[PDB]
């Protein structure tokens, strides 16, 4: 289940290992655009939240 | 360099290079002006001596 | 102007215009400084004459 564009859902991710490879290697993601970050570099970065 | 990939980071690197080059050019221009001023002052001091 | 359409050639020529104008401006500023130096030297030469 996914929420409507209004009253959209919001989930906070913190204190965990982010394996963006399993996210990029998904087939149905026909559109994948990142701003200020390159998908190939996600696995080497760390964020505050 | 860490966040972006070379293709899209080239524009940002070029922007920063342009900014820093212009800053250094202005700095050296001011330095040349002050050097000419101090050269005139040194000529006056030598004449006075 | 050959291997690019005019719309993109506009933003690709912006760089050449600004860079060559900055180069000519730097040259003219250096020549102004040198001309001030030469004017001082010529004034000294006339006084000595």
From Swiss-Prot, chain A:
The domain of life is Viruses
The outcome of changing residue 1 to K is: In strain: Mu/B.1.621
On assembly, the entry states: Binds to host ACE2. RBD also interacts with the N-linked glycan on 'Asn-90' of ACE2. Cleavage of S generates a polybasic C-terminal sequence on S1 that binds to host Neuropilin-1 (NRP1) and Neuropilin-2 (NRP2) receptors. Interacts with host integrin alpha-5/beta-1 (ITGA5:ITGB1) and with ACE2 in complex with integrin alpha-5/beta-1 (ITGA5:ITGB1). May interact via cytoplasmic c-terminus with M protein. May interact (via N-terminus) with host bilirubin and biliverdin, thereby preventing antibody binding to the SARS-CoV-2 spike NTD via an allosteric mechanism.
Query: What task does this protein carry out?
Result: Attaches the virion to the cell membrane by interacting with host receptor, initiating the infection. The major receptor is host ACE2. When S2/S2' has been cleaved, binding to the receptor triggers direct fusion at the cell membrane. When S2/S2' has not been cleaved, binding to the receptor results in internalization of the virus by endocytosis using host TFRC and GRM2 and leading to fusion of the virion membrane with the host endosomal membrane. Alternatively, may use NRP1/NRP2 and integrin as entry receptors.
State the name under which the record lists this protein. Answer: Spike protein S1
Primary gene name: S
């Amino acid at each position: 289940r996914f929420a409507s564009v209004y009253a959209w859902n919001r989930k906070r991710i913190s204190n965990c290992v982010a394996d963006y490879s399993v996210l990029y290697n998904f087939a149905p993601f026909f559109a994948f655009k990142c701003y200020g970050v390159s998908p190939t570099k996600l696995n080497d970065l760390c964020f505050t939240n | 360099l860490s966040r972006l990939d070379p293709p899209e980071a080239e524009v940002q690197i070029d922007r920063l290079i342009t900014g820093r080059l212009q800053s250094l050019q202005t700095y050296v221009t001011q330095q040349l002006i002050r050097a000419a001023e101090i050269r005139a002052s040194a000529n006056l001091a030598a004449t006075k001596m």
